[PDB]
Design a protein around this ligand. Sequence first.
Ligand SMILES: CC(C)C[C@H](NC(=O)CNP(=O)(O)CNC(=O)OCc1ccccc1)C(=O)O
Ligand SMILES: [Ca+2]
Ligand SMILES: [Ca+2]
Ligand SMILES: [Ca+2]
Ligand SMILES: [Ca+2]
Ligand SMILES: [Xe]
Ligand SMILES: [Xe]
Ligand SMILES: [Zn+2]
Length: 316
Amino acid sequence: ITGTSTVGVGRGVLGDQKNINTTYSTYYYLQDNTRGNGIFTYDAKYRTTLPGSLWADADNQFFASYDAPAVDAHYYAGVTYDYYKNVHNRLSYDGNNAAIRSSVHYSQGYNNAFWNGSQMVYGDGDGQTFIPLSGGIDVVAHELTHAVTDYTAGLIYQNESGAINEAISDIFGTLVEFYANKNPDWEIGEDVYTPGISGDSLRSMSDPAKYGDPDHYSKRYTGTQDNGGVHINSGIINKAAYLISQGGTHYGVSVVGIGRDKLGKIFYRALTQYLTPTSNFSQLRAAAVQSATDLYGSTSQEVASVKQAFDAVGVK
Ligand SMILES: CC(C)C[C@H](NC(=O)CNP(=O)(O)CNC(=O)OCc1ccccc1)C(=O)O
Ligand SMILES: [Ca+2]
Ligand SMILES: [Ca+2]
Ligand SMILES: [Ca+2]
Ligand SMILES: [Ca+2]
Ligand SMILES: [Xe]
Ligand SMILES: [Xe]
Ligand SMILES: [Zn+2]
């Protein structure tokens, strides 16, 4: 909408207060004009018609329970935009400052979030498996990273290319969580998953097997559920990424860690310069090796560590 840029205040899903960029024109809208061509947050009103209505508020104060998922979707989209701009010199998901749109309160009791090809969509959860999913910065960044992938490598959402697609979203969701530096970890979704159970998460990158996902290519899922295991076999790549960053010895193979920032550089370059819609895990290894070679040199520790990490998870 046309209006003037303002700054509202509210509380997110976890009860934390934060400032949000809004736009005033009769109402205060969840429209942040400070980033690219805008970040826009919509109310789906418990329905499944998208996007719903641009979120309007009479007073620029967002402290109602119903407001909390919108506050967090809007704020964490901003943090994710900032990560990609400041760390990778990428302007929004298309590289040309495309407007970022999100809808919250999608459906009833909806235990998921997704990128629908055009926008982010967040359920509120059923209150037992999940609380509103925009409360997780890693979840928001995971979703927005799907848009980045779709505009770049284009990894088809099935089988190995789809597991790479998933792992890229988990990797960058985690890197955004570290960038914001509030309770960061290598787990996925811990802030919104299972409010009655402490210490769990949807997936673990450091130990995928903790939540039943493979940590070695010999344990890959080969069936048809979950689009050929895209959220299952992602564990193999998530583990490789974790090892590249943090190091470790896994199935007897030792990996010298190089840190999160270099992990992010290598995988961002692989995603945007080398991967294609049909890339498989072996091709991802090659893309990551080449990316590290471009950035750090063929004799570098960084290249050696990428090779060790893929060796450790059985990907040649
Ligand atoms: C219990 C769940 C939260 C676990 C998992 N989801 C995630 O980890 C995050 N959402 P996501 O990975 O973005 C879904 N996304 C998904 O399933 O893609 C299908 C699609 C294709 C094209 C258009 C619209 C939707 C799942 O779906 O099994
Ligand atoms: Ca209000
Ligand atoms: Ca965390
Ligand atoms: Ca996390
Ligand atoms: Ca939990
Ligand atoms: Xe982005
Ligand atoms: Xe997620
Ligand atoms: Zn995903």
